[PDB]
């Protein structure tokens, strides 16, 4: 099974005579889909991996200045100039400073001074455009009627057997048909990149910390930047946003850098969506994928089965899930072959009357070996009740009081 050890679990029932069961999948959220005569499936959106993107803008948050130089002329002589003004790697500024008989000239007033310095970046961030064409959603399915993960030792395990398969959903390929096998085929025509992840979002990378940022919030980040084309010794634009030179007492201006800007922007995207995980593929931490479920060509596994006879015996203690459902795991201990597990909630013992709801539709034992275990889930009624599985002879009861 799957989808039992989570809180964000959403139960939905399928219309009798209808094959469309629309549902919403989200990161960290599970969905349990049930029908009247169709098997119960547990679907979950596991990963949203985006990859193979191109950079748009690259902002610098750690800049280092170098090569401080200046050239100045006295008031009446005119405006100052320095050769490094025409250089694309230098930031300059023209300001007025006191001049007169004291310094170097013969007239009092304000002379012109130009101060240039060689800009260079030490640490920068890169934002990329994630076009709808390249991102892969992953959805995991798990049908009820198995113990934990049989023969497949992991939980994801494999795609090679029934009850377990992964369906990759991506825009330009939204519809998908999951070949469960034996149980049939579960269709899902999901709705990718419209349920969420609109084109306002860029994939921002800074110091291995990744995020998704809005459309114009990334455009006007007040930092030096260069466009989406990378070459050696890049050309930085608006370097003055990180290199400030404002006036001193007089006679010269000082140029200082704005220090680092990593934590300054760390607090600037509070609440923004996060995509921390890496491995050459951005693994998102948020999802709101809308999907449509097609229950046309799936069928119950245990409909042509006869009821099991060699009564069960409990394996673990029946536990109450987070939403009130009951879960039990039992070892059948009889080589009846493939047979249908009789499961029922009984308020009394006179007649085993249906009192509540059964989550795992028609539990079935799997193999023909001697001892086999299986897990099923039930929906108890509010108040006192019992739990009985097996034929009347050698029944097993467990007192259960829910809410």
């Amino acid at each position, epitope marked *: 099974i799957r989808c039992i050890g989570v809180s964000n679990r959403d139960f939905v029932e399928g219309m009798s005579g209808g094959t469309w069961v629309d549902v919403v999948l989200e990161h960290g959220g599970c969905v349990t889909v049930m029908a009247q005569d169709k098997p119960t499936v547990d679907i979950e959106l596991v990963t949203t991996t985006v*990859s*193979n*993107m*191109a*950079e748009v803008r690259s902002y610098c948050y750690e800049a280092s200045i170098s090569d401080m130089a200046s050239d100045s002329r006295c008031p009446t002589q005119g405006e100052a100039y320095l050769d490094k003004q025409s250089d694309t790697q230098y930031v300059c500024k023209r300001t007025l400073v006191d001049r007169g008989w004291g310094n170097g000239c013969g007239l009092f007033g304000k002379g012109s001074l130009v101060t240039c310095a060689k800009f260079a970046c030490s640490k920068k961030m890169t934002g990329k455009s994630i*076009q709808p*064409e*390249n991102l892969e959603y992953r959805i995991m399915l798990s049908v009820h009627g198995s113990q934990h993960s049989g023969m497949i030792v992991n939980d994801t395990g494999h795609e090679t057997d029934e009850n377990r398969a992964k369906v990759e959903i991506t825009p330009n390929s939204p519809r998908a048909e999951a070949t469960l096998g034996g149980f049939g085929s579960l269709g899902l025509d999901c709705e990718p990149r419209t349920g969420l992840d609109f084109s306002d979002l860029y994939y921002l990378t800074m110091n291995n910390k990744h995020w998704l940022v809005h459309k114009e919030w990334f455009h006007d980040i007040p930092l030096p930047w260069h466009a*989406g*084309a*990378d*070459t*050696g010794t890049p050309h930085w634009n608006n370097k003055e946003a990180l290199v400030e030179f404002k006036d001193a007492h007089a006679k010269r201006q000082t140029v200082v850098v704005l220090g680092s800007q990593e934590g300054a922007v760390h607090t600037a995207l509070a609440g923004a969506l996060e995509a921390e995980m890496d491995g*050459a593929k951005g693994r998102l931490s948020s999802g709101h994928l809308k999907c449509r479920l097609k229950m046309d060509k799936l069928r119950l596994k245990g409909v042509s089965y006869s009821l099991c006879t060699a009564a069960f015996t409990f394996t673990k203690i029946p536990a109450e899930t987070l939403h009130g459902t009951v879960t039990v795991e039992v070892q059948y201990a009889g080589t009846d072959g493939p047979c249908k597990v009789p499961a029922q909630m009984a308020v009394d013992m006179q007649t085993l009357t249906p009192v509540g709801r059964l989550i795992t539709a028609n539990p079935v034992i799997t193999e023909s070996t001697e001892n086999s275990k299986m897990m099923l889930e039930l929906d108890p009624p509010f108040g006192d009740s019992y739990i009985v599985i097996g034929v009347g002879e050698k029944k097993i009861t467990h007192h259960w009081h829910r809410s």
Partner: antibody, heavy 124, light 115 residues
Framework: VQLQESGPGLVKPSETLSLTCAVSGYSISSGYYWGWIRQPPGKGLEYIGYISGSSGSTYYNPSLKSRVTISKDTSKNQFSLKLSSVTAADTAVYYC?????????????????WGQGVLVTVSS | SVLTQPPSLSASPGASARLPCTLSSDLSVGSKNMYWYQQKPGSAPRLFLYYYSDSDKQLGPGVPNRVSGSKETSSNTAFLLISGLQPEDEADYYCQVYDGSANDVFGSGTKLTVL
């Protein structure tokens, strides 16, 4: 848009080599870039340059700093190439080509129309 | 600046042939306009396929739609995919871009051989 390249077969060492192609079916004074690309048989492609049909601007391989000089004749609708002071290792097969760089639907940036090829060797 | 290319390629008729073209460390494959030329001995190289993205791509004159392109910016390599290998396509392929000063850089020549 026929491109017709032709020229001499053998140029001697330390001599100015020249080849020319006529654009048989398209006027040069329209904007497209017309250039030369050479390669020895079995060796990779190496561009020589290209000349403008509008302004006459020329930009060549960085290795051939002053060696090549792409000529032109707009009225007769031909454009030439004058590799001055050739070396012995310049033996290769040369190709005439037409490309665009002025923004016409980037596919046209790559050389879409080629010539036939002229085998040139430098020997004594 | 130079682009690396594989010398040897072999694939079964009907399979998908993957032709890589790895740009140098000074170039980012995601932001370069890729151009693919096809050449057989005795013929000038015809322009085969231009590719920049799955929404910015242009095929050649009379080239079937089984010729696609792709990029892997993790390894910084551009691709030339040919599904359903027919015998007429066996030739040597080249990739080409233009760098900062608009200099064309070609590859080594991928010798495609369909079994």
């Amino acid at each position: 848009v026929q491109l017709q390249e032709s020229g001499p077969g053998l140029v001697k060492p330390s001599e100015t080599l020249s080849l020319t192609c006529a654009v048989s079916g398209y006027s040069i004074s329209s904007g497209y870039y017309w250039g030369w690309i050479r390669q020895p048989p079995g060796k990779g492609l190496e561009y020589i340059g290209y000349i403008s049909g509008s302004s006459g601007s020329t930009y060549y391989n960085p290795s051939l700093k002053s060696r090549v000089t792409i000529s032109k004749d707009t009225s007769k609708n031909q454009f030439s190439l004058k590799l001055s002071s050739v070396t012995a290792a310049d033996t290769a097969v040369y190709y005439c080509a037409r490309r665009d760089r002025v923004g016409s639907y980037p596919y046209y940036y790559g050389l879409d129309s080629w010539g036939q090829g002229v085998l040139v060797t430098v020997s004594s | 600046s130079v682009l690396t290319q594989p010398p040897s390629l072999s694939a079964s008729p009907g399979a998908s042939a993957r032709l890589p073209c790895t740009l140098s460390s000074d170039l980012s494959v995601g932001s370069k306009n890729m151009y693919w030329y096809q050449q057989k001995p005795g013929s000038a190289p015809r322009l085969f396929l231009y590719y920049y993205s799955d929404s910015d791509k242009q095929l050649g004159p009379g080239v079937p739609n089984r010729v696609s392109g792709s990029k892997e910016t993790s390894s910084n390599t551009a691709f030339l995919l040919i599904s359903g290998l027919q015998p007429e396509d066996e030739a040597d392929y080249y990739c080409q871009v233009y760098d900062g000063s608009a200099n064309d850089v070609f590859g080594s020549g991928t010798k495609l051989t369909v079994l």
